[PDB]
């Protein structure tokens, strides 16, 4: 988060924000529950009511992550349709305009397919989170039994300190305690391992997607440079278009670079 | 008789693990069930040890009292 | 109290009062019962009517202390809101003014959170007072029984000095007296211990809060020094503001000093 020490819900402008004023807030921000509907909210609340207490939060996280994946795939499909129909509109235009919008449509198609691949990786990470949820929520009943048996032992001791069940219940409490402390140890180990692996995978997918999208954007801007933005004076003829070969090579190079990209090929250097 | 259900749970869980492995060796429940089997086994072998100890002590004391 | 030997409800001016004339009395002193309402007064009176006689005063003290804590938390929340909305007003002003009022708002926010911490300590001290009230008010019925039994013994002796109940009642009076004198001894011991511990805790919290607030005030005055109070002549332009970094370091140092403060770090030296 970028907030400086102030009560303001506004952050100090960065270098990009200093370069130009930020655009006004989106006009599509309507008034609603802030999420669109209620069925997924009911699912989330059910995850927050019925599940075991100590696993309830992680089950809710898994459900919300599934919602995020659903929304991401839906918006990727919608972006694909938008690119297709944008190029459809650009078909009946100037030949230069038609070619430029067609190539932009292909680039957005690549962006959509890369989004789909990142979505598959994101679902793999979500499955890992589901696995850690499962193991930890199945290790919870050990401590549940420990708490129940210690409460029963306290109640029996208060009611009848000389009851014969005291010794056997004490052995059982010891046994659940040996079952439980070291189970906590194993749970911590597996939680650390699974969390580290899943988040490393997720961040590798994130950086790969970001770098591929950045390369696509750079190639698209270089190809936009090809577009002739010089206006033609009223009443004049249309100059001939000869950018088929240049955009031809540009899209060829974009595909070649996308094939060539590797995890080590990432040029992002954190400091 | 109260230490018996520990081995009962161990046998039930090992049967369930064998059945799950036969039905689906790649099922996600295999790992958690294996941890639970380990846990019941750590619960059970040393419980057998303690049971042997307490059985020896109680039997010796009771029979010494009876014979006296 | 600062009153000198005079009938005046006025005290000799101190060095601070000698430096400048005291401000006139507050204009918000309205006419009312002097406390605002009646429900808490009813609670206090109920504490002063229904409870055991010798514990009634301490129960009243606990109730009044709860009232004080309620008022303190309410005024801390109101001060927090005042700081927030003051900085809100200062948002639409000069950039120097905006920054200075924002940092002052953060400082008052720190004052409010320190007040909340002191309030928690004060409630711990109030709970200790409640504990001493409980033990002493539960030891009162021993002396109550002693007084009742001695009155009964006197009445029986007057009515029938040869009654057979005289001897058994005398043994019971002896027994309550052995129950009561040494109970007074134990009550004195526990009262001394609890009072000393609770008041030491309260005064430690008081001095910690005072020192932290004093450091905040000193840093705030040093930061007010940063403000450019030089007026600009009519019709002129606004000089550029460059105090972001200086206030940046000032608030950083204030936070560092607040972290560094310890009980032994207090620089107040009573003589």
Q: CA nearest A114: which of A83, A155, A150, A159? A: A83
CB within 8 Å of C183: residues ≥ 6 apart: C139, C142, C143
Q: What does each C-alpha distance from C171 to A62, C45, C139, C145, C166 come to in angstroms?
A: 75, 40, 21, 14, 9
DSSP B3: S
Tell me if C222 sits within 8 A of C174, measured CB to CB.
Answer: no
Which token pair is C158? 């007057």
Contacting residues of B for A130, CB less than 8 Å apart:
28
Do the beta carbons of residue A123 and residue A198 sit within 8 Å? no
**Quick check: B47 and A175 CB within 8 A?**
yes
Q: What is the resolution of this structure in A?
A: 3.7
- Whole-angstrom distance, CA of residue A58 vs CA of residue A62: 6
CA distance A118 to A248: 27
The verdict on C70 touching A (C-beta cutoff 8 Å) is no
Q: Using CA atoms, how far apart are residues A70 and A58, in angstroms rounded to an integer?
A: 18
Dihedral sign, CA of C181, C182, C183, C184? positive
Q: At what angle do helices A165-226 and B29-67 cross, to 10 degrees?
A: 170
Cα angle A220, A225, A231; round to 5: 130
Angle between helices A95-159 and A53-91 (to 10 degrees): 170
For residues B44 and B6, is the Cβ–Cβ distance under 8 A? Answer: yes
d(CA C99, CA C105) in angstroms, rounded, equals 10
Residues 6+ apart with CB under 8 A from C212: C114, C258, C261
Nearest neighbour of B28 by CB, restricted to A131, A139, A175: A131
Interface contact A175-B31, CB threshold 8 A: no
Task: Note whether C257 and C219 are within 8 A (CB).
Answer: yes
Q: Is A243 in a helix, a strand, or coil?
A: coil
Structure token pair of residue A236:
């004049």
Tokens encoding A25: 């807030």
**For testing the chain C interface, which of A3, A4, A7, A10 should be mutated: the one with the most C CBs within 10 Å?**
A7
Instruction: Output the CA angle B8-B13-B17, nearest 5 degrees.
Output: 150
Radius of gyration of chain C measured on its C-alpha atoms: 29
Nearest to A105 by CA among A220, A226, A250: A220
C69 within 8 A of C119, measured Cβ to Cβ:
yes
State the method.
cryo-EM
CA distances from C77 to C83, C108, C255 (A): 10, 11, 21
A contacts of B29 (beta carbons < 8 Å): 134
* Rg over CA atoms, chain B: 18
């Amino acid at each position: 988060m970028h907030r400086t020490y102030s009560l303001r819900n506004s952050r100090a402008p960065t270098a990009s924000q200093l370069q130009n004023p930020p655009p006004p807030p989106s006009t599509t921000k309507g008034r609603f529950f802030g999420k669109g509907g209620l069925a997924y909210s009911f699912r989330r609340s059910a995850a927050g009511a019925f599940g075991p207490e100590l696993s309830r939060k992680l089950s809710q996280l898994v459900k919300i992550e599934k919602n995020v994946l659903r929304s991401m795939e839906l918006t990727a499909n919608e972006r694909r349709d938008a690119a297709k129909q944008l190029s459809i509109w650009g078909l009946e235009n100037d030949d230069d305009v038609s070619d430029i919008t067609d190539k932009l449509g292909v680039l957005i198609y690549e962006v959509s397919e890369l989004d789909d691949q990142f979505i598959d990786r994101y679902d793999q990470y979500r499955l890992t989170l589901k696995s850690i949820r499962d193991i930890e929520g199945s290790v919870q009943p050990s401590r549940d039994r420990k708490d129940k048996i210690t409460d029963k032992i306290a109640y029996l001791k208060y009611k009848d300190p000389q009851s014969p069940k005291i010794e056997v219940l004490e052995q059982e409490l010891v046994r659940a305690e040996a079952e439980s402390l070291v189970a906590e140890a194993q749970l911590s180990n597996i939680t650390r391992s699974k969390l580290r692996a899943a988040f490393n995978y997720q961040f590798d997918s994130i950086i790969e997607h970001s770098e591929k999208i950045a390369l696509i954007a750079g190639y698209g801007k270089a190809l936009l440079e090809l577009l002739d933005d010089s206006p033609v004076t009223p009443g004049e003829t249309r100059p001939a278009y000869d950018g088929y070969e240049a955009s031809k090579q540009i899209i060829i190079d974009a595909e070649s670079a996308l094939n060539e990209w590797t995890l080590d090929s990432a040029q992002v250097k954190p400091t």
